Amino acid sequence: SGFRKMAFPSGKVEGCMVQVTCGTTTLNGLWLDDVVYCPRHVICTSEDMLNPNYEDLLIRKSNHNFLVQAGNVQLRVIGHSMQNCVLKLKVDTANPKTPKYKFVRIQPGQTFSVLACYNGSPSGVYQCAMRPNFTIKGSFLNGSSGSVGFNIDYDCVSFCYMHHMELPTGVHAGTDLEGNFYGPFVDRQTAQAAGTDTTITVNVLAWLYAAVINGDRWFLNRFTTTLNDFNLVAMKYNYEPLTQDHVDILGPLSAQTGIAVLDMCASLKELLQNGMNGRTILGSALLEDEFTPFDVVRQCSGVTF
Amino acid sequence: SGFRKMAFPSGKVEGCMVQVTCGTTTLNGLWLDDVVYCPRHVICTSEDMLNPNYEDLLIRKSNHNFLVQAGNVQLRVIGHSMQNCVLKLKVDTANPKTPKYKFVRIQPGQTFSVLACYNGSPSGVYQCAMRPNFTIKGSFLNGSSGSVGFNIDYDCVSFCYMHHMELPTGVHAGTDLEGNFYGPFVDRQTAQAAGTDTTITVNVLAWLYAAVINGDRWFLNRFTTTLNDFNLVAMKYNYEPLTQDHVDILGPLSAQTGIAVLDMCASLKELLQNGMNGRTILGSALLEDEFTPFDVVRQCSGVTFQ
């Protein structure tokens, strides 16, 4: 019993984190076999970040310009190649602790654990979500760019994110490990801003299902909605559309509790209209939206890796 | 910027986790060097549990009665002793991933990371506080006993909690890694019940400070209070007494932000009396009490000018 914001076991990712210096600029890198990925903005300095020519700055740079450290040990860079917004430094040594991995691009509303690093040194792990506006509300200080977010999908670490920059609102943008940014953001100091954030409806419903599983029934009601009308109400509370796809990934939880998804949408309809009125669900006074359906299943079945 | 419930990385602990089976009971062990620590209730059938005598049950066991597994690989048990409520199984191999480590008993209010495991494999990691009534509000299912809490100081893992059992209220009870229970709890099947739970007052303040550090100020005020007039209002809202030991650890956060502890205590007093009034602090509608001052410094602190 109980329900917590649970992070993935960060073990198999801690072995992959390294330091990458270039000038006086230090950030973090991900070491997988004989390649070290990091933000291409390690090459820039403070002037260049105002308006960078990455293709002309990587020219005036050679292998010896990149210092790469793995604990006490040093690593020898035997090539480079900037793909999109991420650097891939070929190095002479394969990481012994390289796990079975893949590179994924996640859709908004999908969650992942973030391993916050400084100086190639993991400091903490937390569970995050890709906001609808393609940011994440992370916890990052100066020098954490290159820290990575990930899932464990069965036996295989799925790298989904690499931190680049902090936007002015306090939120955070980055790339997949192919270097292609999430959202409209770009690696340069300009007047970028995040959109307005909205709530990830399908995750809220997942969490209401968790609450039912763990014994909370008060928010349930005989009322009934259609998919269309729910979205009309929800939309005025900054809730993301619930699609027919969404209604399917909720079908497992629908059948474990015998509550149709549309009946749960009616429960959520009334919580939006009437509020919560100083009541808690699963130790919470707000509607949590950072647990996916699969996150619920995992915590409630005791899924291991 | 930002502020999350941040767990310590769990790798150093992942490499220690093993599966311990005895009879029909399977649970988790901790493989440090050539010893496996696990809860001693693994040797009980549920008929003994009703009123067991543990040194009597342990002297009936053979080494071969313990199935210990690390991955596919069975470990050979060569000895078995008790220390309070934990079994030390001597195995024949030393754990090659054994981190630098140490066993520490924590106090109520302090926090730690928990690696929830089943069958010696980890399910995930989360931060917890030792509640003042010596329970924890974990997420633990059947098979989770043997899971451990831990803090990490540099390279060094300070194991502080081992999970044993779930109480009727759905909170969790366990021991330090020397076998002594946190709280008045016993590993036999009796009526047991958690004492009254209260809010860790020092921790809330640490979190109001973390809020001010992240640019929330809406809940501050010019009002100031005596420590005693606070506790008078606080106690009636189910809060722990605040005391100089607490004030003197907030000191750095009170200094980094410029807000005298006694002023932060007048902010909280007003939050208690008037409620939050449809507002949020660090994305929360409740006052959070599972962040210690140290978890705040850990997470959102930098260079200070002298």
Residue numbers in the entry:
A (entry chain B): 1 to 305
B (entry chain A): 1 to 306
In the authors' words:
In addition to its essential role in viral polyprotein processing, the SARS-CoV-2 3C-like protease (3CLpro) can cleave human immune signaling proteins, like NF-κB Essential Modulator (NEMO) and deregulate the host immune response. Functionally, 3CLpro recognizes a hydrophobic substrate residue at P2 (usually Phe or Leu), a Gln at P1, and Ser, Val, Asn, or Ala residues at P1’. NEMO is necessary for activating NF-κB during the canonical NF-κB response signaling pathway, which is a critical first response to viral infection.
Within the asymmetric unit, the C-terminal tail (Ser301-Gln306) of chain A inserts into the substrate-binding site of chain D. Additionally, the substrate-binding site of chain A is bound by the C-terminal tail of chain D from a neighboring symmetry equivalent dimer. This C-terminal tail-binding contributes to crystal lattice formation by connecting chains A and D to each other throughout the crystal. Our C145S construct terminates at the P1 position (Gln306) and so lacks the residues corresponding to P1’ to P3’. Thr26 and Thr190 form H-bonds with Ala233 (P2’) and Ala228 (P4) of the hNEMO peptide, respectively. This causes the distance between the Cɑ atoms of Thr26 and Thr190 to decrease.
